[PDB]
Design a protein around this nucleic acid. Structure first.
Ligand SMILES: [Mn+2]
Length: 395
RNA sequence: UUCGACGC
RNA sequence: GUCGAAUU
């Protein structure tokens, strides 16, 4: 229903102009804390008007929308549009003392994006931009969205979902794997609060399909060990797994391993030894047109949650299957409503820009990682640190 | 790579 | 390549 921003304010969802005006008035839910109060802009068009306007917009929005005050932006010019010359300005910036780097790429050069991006994820919060894509017409839409994600990557919290703290899971784990070609894959596991904020993330190395279940288990254990070490008193009595991704087909073996992993985390006191949990498969299914937030039951274990398209009335359904749960027959229906509601609230959380993705954050954010992991691997960049664990570097 | 959507 | 980004 509403987004919680700063100073105790809440603004309706589904209205980006009201969210922006809200941030100008009250601030974000959390301003990032900075060490230098300095950010670098790195580019190769020193007399460019578009870059001039870009700098001045970033400067005024950072202060006025984001309430990050007195930041200095320093500029660094590179003079050849290739890896070693840009990297050299990047290095100059990092030696200067900066909280993050905004890097304007020159043209369209995919190997160069992945090479530079993998070096920076490893170093310092960064936000790329394309010189060719700038225009006066779209500059304000462009900077508005760009800063939602750069503020997050600097450790800020734009807005969180307003949810009933008595309803839903204590934590939600988005987990699964994504195949990056026909043989190789990586596992992921991400812990969320019910308010849609990411608490911790782990990704496995790239492995082969034969190694899927082995790394699925360990990646999930690492992410919970991580969450628990930085939240020792967060009791988990209600736990939900959101399983997603193009991964090997292996559903019974996979459910058995997920069940085992929760039984080991109980033994190790990472969750309650009487935790109530459900393991769910979330799958995007083919769109359709009515010629909603609606919950459809297809069988006692298969459900559909229908959502407007984030763009006849077009609908993007999300399939939801309960593959395992330890719920009582009595609790059952009630729990089904809560878990479906929660999936709907999470589908409204997106720190990539102002517009809702209408896809659950637990499904969406692992897709964003996958794109980077796949292409870094393909273009031979630097493989992707408690900093990367708590920060949404993939946005 | 601000992002999205279409068409091929 | 074709639009679009308060009001989805
Ligand atoms: Mn991004």
């Amino acid at each position: 229903l509403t987004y919680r921003i700063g100073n105790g304010a809440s603004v309706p969802i589904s209205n980006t102009g009201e969210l922006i005006k809200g941030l100008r008035n009250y601030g974000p839910y959390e301003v990032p804390s900075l060490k230098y109060n300095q950010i670098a802009l790195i580019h190769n068009n020193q007399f460019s008007s578009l870059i001039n306007q870009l700098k001045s917009q970033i400067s005024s929005k950072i202060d006025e929308v984001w309430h990050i005050h007195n930041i200095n932006i320093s500029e660094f010019i590179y003079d050849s549009p290739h890896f070693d010359s840009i990297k050299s300005q990047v290095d100059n910036a990092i030696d200067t003392g900066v909280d993050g780097i905004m890097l304007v790429l020159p043209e369209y050069n995919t190997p160069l994006y992945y090479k530079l991006k993998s070096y920076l994820i490893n170093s310092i919060p960064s936000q790329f931009m394309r010189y060719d894509i700038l225009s006066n017409r779209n500059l304000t839409f462009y900077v508005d969205n760009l800063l939602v994600q750069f503020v997050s990557k600097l450790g800020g919290k734009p807005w969180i979902l307003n949810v009933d703290p008595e309803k839903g899971s204590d934590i939600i784990i988005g987990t699964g794997a994504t195949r990056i070609d026909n043989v190789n894959l990586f596992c992921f596991a991400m812990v969320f609060k019910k308010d849609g904020t990411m608490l911790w993330n782990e990704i496995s190395p790239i492995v082969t399909s034969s190694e899927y279940l082995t790394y699925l288990k360990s990646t999930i254990k690492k992410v919970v060990y991580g969450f628990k070490k930085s939240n020792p008193d967060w009791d988990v009595e209600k736990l939900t797994l959101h399983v997603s991704g193009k991964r090997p087909k292996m559903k019974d073996g996979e459910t058995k391993i997920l069940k085992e992993t929760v039984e080991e985390l109980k033994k190790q006191e990472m969750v309650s030894r009487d935790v109530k949990y459900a393991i769910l498969h979330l799958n995007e299914t083919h769109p359709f047109w009515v010629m909603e937030g609606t919950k459809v039951k297809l069988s006692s274990k298969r459900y559909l949650l229908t959502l407007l398209q984030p763009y006849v009335t077009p609908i993007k359904p999300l399939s939801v299957e309960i593959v395992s749960d330890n719920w009582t027959s009595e609790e059952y229906y009630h729990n089904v409503h809560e878990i479906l509601d929660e999936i709907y609230y999470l589908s409204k959380m997106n720190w990539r820009g102002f517009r809702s993705r209408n896809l659950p954050v637990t499904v969406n954010y692992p897709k964003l990682v996958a794109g980077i992991i796949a292409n870094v691997n393909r273009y031979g960049g630097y493989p992707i640190n408690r900093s990367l664990q708590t920060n949404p570097w993939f946005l």
